[PDB]
């Protein structure tokens, strides 16, 4: 009935709920959060300014806010096995900024994964505060295997002499060896920071090795595979680092935290501590593998590194369509959303790319299994193969509606 | 019933809803958002990654997100009379960071209001990124009048030669002359940034003259007097500056925006565009004047600057209780929340202070008027006079309960 006061706004919110229902979401970073997560960030906790930390706030009337934030901190520590957690970062990007501010100074040398191989903007892009403030040098995957080569990264680190190595990626499909990253860091006297945003849910589910025992500091989004609200999180085992991180988040970088979003983080972290989260992770892994297998067996398509051991994979589409932007646009026509993506050693424009990135988390959260995941990948191959046949795309779009009706979003 | 799964979290949220109902909220930054604002940030908009700007997103299936974000932008532009708006900043601190990144360089000199006279942490505190990155040199209020002296500030600017002047405050009761601030900036070829976070509601209601025609760039929180969700907003009339601001917010400082929060910004901005919002502003002014008048007349209390023309005022409490912190602790015992606050030329430790800060927006949103405001101020005078008479406090707590039951929070 507040809806009656603002139809243009509430019409658009209702349309987005229906678009999410009627579309197959394969964007590897996306998920479907619980009713409980959305309800928690729709609470009157937005009415309370909580500058500072539990028991050490700028203002009064914060005793109950302190219970909520302490639940989020304790559940993070328990879930990831860390001695310290900071649940205030507004975003993964703000989490990363606080860690740089805590460990290094402006102009220090940092190594981060190449943006074409899956490094984030905040891992040294020149258009990011990261690239503008610090001296980032990128490491890549091997050109032939498309795998991290820890011997090559070591040789580069001994030349570059970084103060900090950043590990973690948004387009890398294989198991990262975090013990090797920390061995590299230790060999050159560098800090190791792991941004586990993409894989945090699989770390929580037991399906990906934890960086937490190896990274001086671990950052993540609470969204993506962890299936939480949009925000950031920082972990460490080192009490002196924890004090600097806390001061860097507030008052270094942010002011008041979003305590309604932190309530939602507490909700999501308790959902990830449930035994049912292990089964989620297992279905995320099986579902992503079942899609990759369709592309591996098709002669016209190549999966980057030959497959996946996580939630995502990339496909070189350039034997079937001109570039990944074309592939993204064709699949959108049949109500399948994914993103064009640069492949390692990408030769085409970053606006076009050679690739698509596919993820399983959102379709897994809707209850889909291996048979549905395989059928979705068969529709992708068929749509790209027949991109100039409207009657084909029309039929695939109608088949997609039967599957979305069968696996309702909420 | 999702709440059965997590009673510790949902019991804490019920405990905060009761705490807010049974508390008289005088923290001058606090407010009571509409059910519509909370509902918008509890939507499945949290599921969509919207890196980029409307029509220029990193990913597809963003055409409905684009309508929502464009409503927030169009409403900010219409409400404040600005040619350009950015609704993505996660916070007021993030909005300010993007403006500095757009207009100046590290090491550049900036003038901002002294932190003791109500400058924000992000206006050059040494523990903020603001003081760490830029050379902040404060202007103060007149020691006698506790007013801004535009002649004194002009002389200081001619001597310091800042690249940027920051105006706006968290603890200043009087009308800030934005036309004079622009004259001062113009005299030295500085940019003028106004942070209107505390007064944006009064600007929107017509009760404070707008900085928007005078500042090169205006920042604000969407929360505080504007009565929106927690977040930031940037306004400018200069198209070249607007492009720099857009790049600085993303990919300069942030990654994906909180589109659920942006929907709530669009909701709050439509509310502020309503004729009822003028009546809200009217009552905020009246209620604050009413409380200020009680302290003005009582002989044991001085109001800083001797009164208010906005939503807040400060009171020197040191003749009645040892320090502002003691006053905060005592009023907490009778279910009245405000904060200890430094006064101009504060002499005591920042952890104690001589002052309390009081504002009207929250009690005004609960539907209270001049009578209840006068009454609340009488209760505050009485509790502080009788601070070690346990039975006087207990009886005030009871009178407070009658008022809170009379004006239900929701
Ligand atoms: C509000 N913050 C002050 C501390 O609450 C206050 O006294 O009211 C404020 C901001 C807040 O930015 P965040 O959203 O916390 O990052 C920024 N600018 C000004 C002038 C404020 O008053
Ligand atoms: C998410 N990054 C990309 C877009 O979502 C992606 O390709 O998946 C991400 C972040 C995001 O931080 P924000 O909350 O948007 O600031 C940070 N770090 C990594 C590794 C990501 O994948
Ligand atoms: Mg506080």
Summarize the structure.
The structure is a homodimer of 410-residue chains. Chain A is 46% helix and 13% strand.
Structural notes for this entry:
The structure is a homodimer of 410-residue chains. Chain A has 410 residues and is α/β, with parallel strands linked by helices. Chain A has two domains: 37-273, Type I PLP-dependent aspartate aminotransferase-like (Major domain) (Aspartate Aminotransferase, domain 2); 278-406, Aspartate Aminotransferase, domain 1 (Alpha-Beta Complex), CATH 3.90.1150.10. Chain A has 16 helices and 15 strands. Chain A has helices at 2-5, 7-22, 35-41, 63-80, 92-103, 129-133, 150-160, 178-187, 200-205, 239-253, 259-273, 275-297, 324-333, 361-365, 370-385, 390-406, and strands at residues 24-25, 52-53, 56-57, 84-86, 109-113, 135-139, 164-167, 191-195, 217-221, 232-236, 302-303, 312-316, 336-337, 339-341, 355-359. In chain A, the strands form four sheets. Chain A has a seven-stranded mixed beta sheet with strand order 4-10-9-8-7-5-6, sandwiched between helices. In chain A, α4 packs parallel to α11 (259-273), α7 packs parallel to α8 and α15 (370-385) packs antiparallel against α16. The longest helix of chain A is centred in the last third of the chain and has 23 residues, at 275-297. The first copy, chain A, is globular and about 65 Å long. Chain A starts with a helix and ends with a helix. At the A-B interface, α2, α3, α4, α5 and α10 of A face α1, α2, α3, α4 and α9 of B. The structure holds ligand O3Z (2 copies) and magnesium ion (MG). One ligand O3Z sits between chains B (29, 91-93, 120, 122, 168, 170, 195, 197-198, 221) and A (49, 51, 254-256).
């Amino acid at each position: 009935d507040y809806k009656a006061f603002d139809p243009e706004l509430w019409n658009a919110i209702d349309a987005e709920a229906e678009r999410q229902q009627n579309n197959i979401e394969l964007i590897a970073s996306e998920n479907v959060v619980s009713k409980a997560v959305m309800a928690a960030q729709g609470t009157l906790l937005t009415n309370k300014s909580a500058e500072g930390y539990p028991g050490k706030r700028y203002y009064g009337g914060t005793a109950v806010i302190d219970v909520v934030e302490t639940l989020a901190i304790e559940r993070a520590k328990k879930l990831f096995g860390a001695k310290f957690a900071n649940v205030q970062p507004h975003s993964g990007s703000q989490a990363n900024a606080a860690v740089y501010m805590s460990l290094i100074q402006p102009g220090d040398t940092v190594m981060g994964m190449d943006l074409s191989a899956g490094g984030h903007l905040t891992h040294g892009a020149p258009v990011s505060f990261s690239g503008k403030t610090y001296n980032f040098v990128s490491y890549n995957v091997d050109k032939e295997s498309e795998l991290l080569d820890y011997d090559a990264i070591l040789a580069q680190a001994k030349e570059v002499r970084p103060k900090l190595i950043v590990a973690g990626a948004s387009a890398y499909s294989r198991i990262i060896d975090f013990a090797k990253f920390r061995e590299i860091a230790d060999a050159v006297g560098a800090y190791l920071m792991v941004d586990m945003a993409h894989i945090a849910g699989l770390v929580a589910s037991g399906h990906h090795p934890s960086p937490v025992p190896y990274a001086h500091v671990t950052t993540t989004t609470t969204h993506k595979t962890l299936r939480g609200p949009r925000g950031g999180l920082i972990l460490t085992d080192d009490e002196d680092i924890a004090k600097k991180l806390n001061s860097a988040v507030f008052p270094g970088l942010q002011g008041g935290p979003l305590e309604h979003v932190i309530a939602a983080k507490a909700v999501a972290l308790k959902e990830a501590l449930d035994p049912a989260f292990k089964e989620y992770g297992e279905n995320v892994i099986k579902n992503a593998a079942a899609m990759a297998d369709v592309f591996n067996q098709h002669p016209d398509f190549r999966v980057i590194s030959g497959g996946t051991n996580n939630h995502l994979f990339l496909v070189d589409v350039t034997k079937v369509v001109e570039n990944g932007k074309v592939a993204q646009n064709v699949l959108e026509e049949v109500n399948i959303t994914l993103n064009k993506n640069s492949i390692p050693y990408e030769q085409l424009s970053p606006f076009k790319t050679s690739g698509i990135r596919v993820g399983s988390p959102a379709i897994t959260s809707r209850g889909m299994g291996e048979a549905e995941s395989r059928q979705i990948a068969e529709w992708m191959v068929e749509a790209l193969e027949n991109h100039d046949k409207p009657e084909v795309l029309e039929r695939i779009r109608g088949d997609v509606k039967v599957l979305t009706d069968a696996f309702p979003l909420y």
